Subunit: 362 residues, 5 copies
């Protein structure tokens, strides 16, 4: 029969047994809370500053022994988002966050709900930037583990405990469509206990798995580099007396490999250690290097063959140097695809096992 | 006969039946509102963080049963934009927004208008960044659907309903001139009902259609790549004994295709899956690959023809290998334009149908 | 004989006939104001988000019927920039602005001056980002019109009118030195009347003209492309039997044109429609395309000439095919500079007239 | 014997002859101030938005006729940085600044010190972005003058005067290490008098000199371009009958000059007028253009020599065309280094004098 | 038996001997503090604006002679992070910081703890951007020293002293994974005394060592440039009469060196002085320059050999010019690897000693 605004200001009023900066059931057992996270948006995964940015709906539920009506018909009251300083809220902060802020749309995006027995539901909508460290030892086949973890600030484990929800603790809205990665539905929820000098502190931690697509990285920087290795292998099927043809093919294949590598370096992320891409670019450059050194090793012999033709022993080394040159051009014609196939097997095997392993440790 | 500032402070005064944080006609039917959106500016459509940014004029109109004069000549009162906290405003927020803010020009860009019967008009001017997910499976021919949707924050469907306006709900100022897309005058306005555990929540949603121009993407990265495929086809019209001419044309056409592809990768947007552009760059590289492998398959036969001329059966395989080489150079001279025309037909058909389909589902 | 701070607080005091949120000479004729704009800095003209950023000194002058002394020696009073909320200020906002803010140097950059009769001078210093739409159909020869316009927010034309100053309304400080454009001293000042459902609203609008220099765009991407067209024309002066010389010149000229075009695409602004630069790059690529197709049309005839020399009628088509080839090499030697000169005349004429036209409409 | 906080609030108390918004010795001579600037950090010199950013320690010293103790042992009092609004401070602002802000570390970075006679020392620590216009007509050899100037806001020259300090007015902390320029120890301090309609306003102006290093710009884009001009000059020492050798050297030298120029354009700053770098790139491209046109002028004569050998007068023009060709190849072999050395002398002289001149005007 | 909030407001109450803006044990010995720094995150090391960004946990511990209970069971009290203005805090600021801010997660990230005797523990969590100057004279082998230092603001050394902690003053959380550098566990902690005109000011300074990995910089821009120098050395093993083969190898090796250098310039950081990378790119370009000038010096002699064969003295200079050419091709075949090996030894020695030296000075 009375408006609730004229009642909610008398529970936490001046003449009432309520202090705003005090724990519920003080000098007693610790008051635990139940958390829930609803991600609206996800992305801007940047490797230079090593972070990402989210929009979450953090919802907390805790019990409080006072603030009970037991004589009113309305079972749920709502507190005004201006005077949030009147109620007690548990000190929560994100451990690995860079920057965070509230939302400033036409209403203050806050919500407080007090039930009959004294249960409090507190749901906000915030956006924030979480730091995550990334390792790119195997870049176009990597998986990434991006975690979050939320602490207390000055309250011990015997004073305030955090708890994940039992059913649907972390929910993700449908249709996110990351530009680089693919998020997985693992969502494993763990615990940490911050052991300090003062005492143990509570922690809970969510953990997302991201897998990188290699579709674009296959069509571009892999198929052209493979095709130009096969194009460098064309010089094993051309006769030796056509000297500027095989030289012009060899050096231009090296030029094609360099402009293929250096033309793509602006698109790749920038780190100071080796990746999986530049090992492939190094071996692909070393093959077009070796297909020209094989030609220089052949042409030196055929040139000093012609120098001895200018000078049966005079012409026995003629047919000896011809059979020597053709046996080099045959054993290179057979050997050069085979060691590259052996390297490509050992490459794709040593990368599939390592990426598979990086998923099992979580 | 009295100034309105000395009257408007007595409607929502202390000794008056008004509470600021209470619903109109409380414990009754839900108070619906009528919304209107006027876009001033539109752009900064970024794909990396998957959002865009607007400047809107959000105008709301709702009825309120109290706050009526019925005895004053002025039919329209104006409230001061400083003390907006005195009146009740419906809690509205954008569901898929990243960040939002008001405008801070010489006056506070707010407006409140109270009519005779109690109708309230509330018009603000805000700027904000809406998240939209983009799919670029067919990049230079794509259409994009960019939506917005606006919710309540804590009020149920039986407590607060949203409604689009009947005539001219969403208006767009003239002369916007996006740098990438072209906006269409569809402006289809739909509804959503957020079904949660607590209850149904109201929603209305605007929906814009953007179509990407392919004028620049046709002149650049399509016409040069086609012309250099025709330039690679010149090597089917040159005689076989000119070996370094056709080799120097073939490898330099491959070099031209690689520097055409890798030179343009900084201008394209960055994703990890395949697009429509690099399928064309893959087939265009595979054609200049195959026009050199056809030459290596011809020159191997003409070289072992000359090797048997160094060694009628001795010269029957001479004319056999010549007719074999010329029949390969003829069937490649006829086949290579035809399968490329068949591929270009199947390409433009499989992209026109998919883009047309992406418009019908809206 | 008294300090003015102890007098200025009694004009707009509590017991005085002053209301802060009321119009001067209420229920009467509209109070007009006189505006003045002094630009300190100008630049950051960005095409991606389609805006620019200024630093202005907005100065307003209006009359007010009260607030007159008529008994004090000091003719000019100064109000403190903290308590600006005591006086009435006209609601002004920029219609096409993205974001705006004040200045927060050691003093609040505000100024209020009240004369004897009641004239008020109000001069602030603000910085703000105005949206402007740009059209780049003719990119390196374009002119741009960048306007600003300032409105009222909720006051009708019969309630508040805006007026430009008579002498020196818009002033520009000397030595601005834009990095891209050149500002002109046109400064044409117009009016708008915002016709809405509620009524007519006042507007005044400044309008700046910017002209883009083409000095860098002439030395780079025009002179090299022209010179390599003349370099492709060298292949009309070399004999036909030197086959790998003219082929190696032709394909490398095509390679030079592609690396000239794609090497410059990162420096150009990014739009989705055609510009004036890539039409020149398309015709310059089509010329080095046609100088190689002319060589393939010549070499096909001289090759089947040699094929008939392998096979007077046997040698009548010998001299017929030689006179046919030399007549093609002569008519291409004369035709290829002439149609390019005709195209370059029609190009520079169709661009000079369009740019000249874009200046006259203002 | 009393705490100073209980005394400093009674000098500027309510019942005391102090007004906060009033000039010292009102209706009298103007109160001058003494300024000092200590730069902590310097950099982010950006040419696109034409500004730079500093961190200064602005310190002011002025006299005030009241606020004297003459009966206390402590000669220096300190005011709390929260209630800075109690004291009078002179209105100072930077004329050519884009944006400015205070510092928000654990304490408010403010300082107030009141001596015995009434001298006030006011020292803050602020960071701010000053606009400077840059002219890049001679880019890799330019000097830049970057000034700052600080005004009053509404106080006339007969009301408030600014003054530089006598010894050490502008100090610079050691070890700044700009990434592009080198700062010089000139630090010339001048005056301005802002003549307006209202009256003269005071100004003082600091002025820094920055000199750009050309060490990187010499090793890269100068030495390779010079070396490839000498590489194009190799074609004057090769015999004429080796046609595809000299053609393949000539066009590839042109290709090397284009990929040297266009490969470096992303590193250069972006303006619309000419610089010193692209004049060198234009003349270096015109030399490799002229070394190929000299070859086409030679090969046309030697080809029509061979055409007349196909047709003593028949063979008198044989030796005439041979002596004509060798005299062209000799006079080009001697002329081409000499006019390039004359151009390189006139180039380095016309740039050294202009850069030297740009230092003397300051 | 009483709640601590009703006691903590009476220690620093109005009727109590506490002033907030006064030093503990005033007119006495200086109150020293003990500091501690815990870095959570580290990175965004940018060279253009010459700074980096951290997230620290600054913890201070000082004694205060008042504020003692000596009659309560709870030994540790906690102050509310809203009313931090009631207590005295020492004025601390970072000397070389660009910008700083607090954290605005659901609770104010502050902590105050008052022990029995009067010891105060004050622990905050802040993020801030420290300026550091970098020198890149030896870029891919450099070490960097990045310091921080924290001052007082207006308090003398005889009024406030800073002190590092004895055990674990600066701690670093595990698993940081910088994208460019590698942090070392040196953490040397020094002192500074700011000698000014007013007096000595206290300072303590932390100092981090960062070492740059050269793994990526070895695979890319070093191995390809070395391999193409060995590819340019192939032209010393090809006979002289194959003129367009060795010319086409030489100029294309120069083209490969230029597109290798200019293709990588976008990935390197931008400075105006020389580095270690472009000295290697200059010598690697000068080697492929000299391997073509050696060929022009050989081919000039063999061409004028053929010119004298067109004209025993007539043929004595034939064998003289042949033995002269082969002795040049032999002494270049032996000399060109040796002086490059001597240069590569003097290069790696002069860079290892300088980098080693830059570690010892700290
Ligand atoms: C004897 C050498 C004299 C010294 C050369 C020198 O300092 O530069 C003079 C000219 C500059 O020509 P300019 O400047 O070319 C720019 C074209 N514009 C004005 C329409 C934008 O340099 C040139 O001539 C190159 C300009 C190429 C043609 C335009
Ligand atoms: C049989 C094939 C075995 C599989 C090959 C494979 O997985 O990579 C092994 C090596 C990696 O050499 P690593 O790593 O080279 C980096 C040089 N460092 C350590 C000083 C920075 O791969 C290489 O050998 C390429 C490294 C080039 C020489 C350095
Ligand atoms: C949750 O909070 C409760 C107190 O509200 C913690 O204390 C438990 O209280 C129950 C009920 O009296 C006892 O049965 C348990 O023995 C108490 N716990 C301990 C450790 O003594 C409780 O620990 C908190 N955590 C959980 C997971 O329930
Ligand atoms: C709009 O608000 C009204 C109440 O102001 C809602 O209730 C309707 O009230 C009318 C008038 O009494 C009745 O005729 C309807 O039956 C009521 N609606 C229902 C669902 O019972 C109304 O629902 C709201 N919405 C619309 C679209 O009118
Ligand atoms: C400027 O404001 C005046 C009122 O202060 C407007 O009204 C004019 O008042 C004058 C003086 O009485 C009359 O002569 C005019 O007829 C009034 N105008 C109209 C339209 O009736 C005036 O309109 C405003 N504008 C201008 C340009 O003066
Ligand atoms: C500095 O301020 C003084 C007043 O405090 C200005 O006035 C001068 O006062 C002295 C002392 O009475 C006279 O000798 C001068 O003649 C006054 N100046 C003038 C222009 O009349 C003074 O002008 C200010 N400036 C300087 C540089 O001293
Ligand atoms: C730390 O603060 C103390 C005062 O609290 C400083 O003064 C010292 O006080 C002790 C105890 O009375 C004396 O033994 C010393 O002689 C005092 N120091 C001096 C310089 O006179 C003390 O200097 C501060 N610093 C350190 C390092 O202790």
């Amino acid at each position: 029969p009375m408006p609730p605004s004229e009642f909610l200001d008398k529970l936490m009023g001046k003449v009432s047994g309520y202090d705003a900066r005090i724990r519920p059931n003080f000098k007693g057992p610790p008051v635990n809370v139940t958390c829930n996270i609803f991600i609206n948006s996800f992305g801007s995964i940047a490797e230079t500053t090593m972070d990402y940015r989210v929009n979450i709906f953090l919802r907390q539920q805790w019990n409080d022994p006072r603030l009970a009506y037991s004589e009113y018909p309305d079972d749920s009251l709502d507190l005004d988002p201006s005077m949030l300083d009147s109620i007690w809220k548990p000190d929560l902060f994100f451990a690995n966050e860079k920057g965070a802020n509230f939302h400033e749309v036409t209403t203050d995006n806050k919500l407080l709900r007090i039930s009959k027995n004294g249960n409090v539901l507190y749901s906000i909508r915030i956006t924030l930037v979480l730091a995550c460290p990334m390792d790119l030892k195997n870049f176009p086949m990597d998986v990434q583990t991006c975690i979050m973890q939320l602490e207390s600030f000055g309250y011990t484990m015997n004073d305030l405990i955090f708890e994940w929800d039992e059913k649907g603790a972390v929910q993700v809205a449908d249709g996110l469509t990351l530009p680089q990665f693919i998020l997985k539905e693992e969502k494993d929820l763990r615990y940490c206990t911050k052991h300090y000098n003062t005492g143990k502190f509570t922690c809970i931690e969510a953990r997302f798995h991201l897998e990188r697509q290699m579709g674009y990285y296959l069509i571009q920087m892999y198929i052209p580099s493979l095709l130009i290795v096969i194009l460098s292998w064309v010089s094993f099927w051309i006769n030796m007396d056509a000297a500027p043809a095989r030289v012009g093919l060899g050096i231009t294949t090296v030029l094609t490999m360099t402009t293929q590598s250096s033309g793509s370096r602006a698109s790749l992320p920038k780190v100071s250690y080796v990746k999986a891409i530049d090992i492939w670019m190094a071996v692909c450059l070393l093959f077009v290097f070796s297909a020209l050194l094989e030609y220089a090793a052949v042409n030196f012999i055929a040139r000093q063959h012609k120098e001895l033709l200018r000078f049966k022993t005079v012409e026995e080394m003629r047919k000896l140097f011809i059979s020597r040159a053709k046996r080099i051009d045959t054993v290179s014609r057979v050997a050069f695809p085979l060691v590259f196939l052996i390297f490509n097997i050992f490459y794709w095997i040593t990368y599939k096992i390592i990426r598979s392993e990086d998923i099992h440790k979580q």
